[PDB]
């Protein structure tokens with residue numbers, strides 16, 4: 001409880017300092033690191049890249065289906081994460097933080113139903129780490 | 134796992150705009166930053182597989198000799214991270230899991246009372262974020 005938080009803090013910090021030397025705390029900590037890095041790179045390359053409390057999942061799902069028009073790849077999965085994060089930031093800027101959990105729920109729905117099969121068939125997240133880093 | 138990934142990414146992107154996913158995500162970021170700053174301010178101004186917690190606890194007790202403060206808590210985190218990195222460099226990756234366990238033990242036995250009396254981790258975020266001045 002009060003204990004778990006500190007354990008979570010120690011893990012996060014140590015993960016970070018390990019990262020800074022090209023080491024990793026765990027495979028998950030490695031996935032997260034590559035995903036953040038990849039997002040940073042995508043956002044820097046495609047810098048030129050409409051949520052409300054009434055927006056349905058179908059509105060999001062249609063826009064994300066335009067992303068995976070020609071098919072799924074690691075670059076396009078990174079763009080998906082980047083897109084979700086841009087929606088969250090837009091919501092906080094517009095004073096609608098209340099929807100950041102909705103966007104997260106939508107991203108987990110879209111990932112599960114459409115991308116987890118592809119991810120599992122193409123060697124999982126371990127393969128993304130292997131390719132990206 | 135995918136929820137953990139979505140949460141971590143969104144946390145990160147929020148952080149990059151000065152926003153936070155949660156209070157915990159706000160504390161993790163402040164420590165990362167604070168650690169980076171401490172390590173940069175005290176750069177060059179700076180264990181075995183049989184080392185007990187008592188050996189670590191003593192060295193850390195030297196850090197808090199004149200008392201607990203936020204600057205010194207940041208130094209504690211920084212010290213633990215330096216030990217982990219030293220252990221991996223020295224091929225003793227075994228010690229990383231232990232060092233983390235020792236750090237969580239020292240926190241719950243010696244620092245959590247002080248942390249709770251001085252406004253908790255929310256206060257650290259408040260103070261540190263403010264100190265980030267231009």
Ligand SMILES: Cc1ccc(CN(C(=O)N[C@@H](CSCc2ccccc2)C(=O)O)C(=O)c2ccc(-c3cccc(-c4ccccc4-c4ccc(Cl)cc4)c3)cc2)cc1
Nearest residue numbers: 038041042046049066067074075076078079082083086132
């Ligand atoms: C790090 C990282 C990532 C992604 C690229 C970019 N990339 C590639 O270069 N891809 C390679 C192989 S994947 C090789 C690979 C392996 C491992 C890691 C990362 C790549 C290729 O296809 O040649 C792509 O796959 C690519 C992807 C997307 C887009 C593009 C750009 C802008 C907008 C839209 C988009 C369309 C429809 C609906 C929504 C969006 C959208 C998306 C995000 C926002 Cl914030 C806003 C809108 C898509 C363009 C290119 C580079 C680096």
Ligand SMILES: Cc1ccc(CN(C(=O)N[C@@H](CSCc2ccccc2)C(=O)O)C(=O)c2ccc(-c3cccc(-c4ccccc4-c4ccc(Cl)cc4)c3)cc2)cc1
Nearest residue numbers: 167170171195196202203204205207208211212215260261
């Ligand atoms: C970001 C951040 C942090 C910490 C300073 C520095 N600082 C202060 O600024 N002190 C403030 C009060 S709290 C300022 C504050 C408020 C809010 C947020 C972050 C800071 C003051 O005195 O006015 C300190 O409290 C201070 C603390 C420690 C140390 C120091 C340095 C070298 C070695 C040792 C040390 C001694 C014994 C045993 C082990 C170690 C050790 C520690 C770390 C490593 Cl990697 C290796 C070894 C400790 C020096 C100073 C600056 C910036």
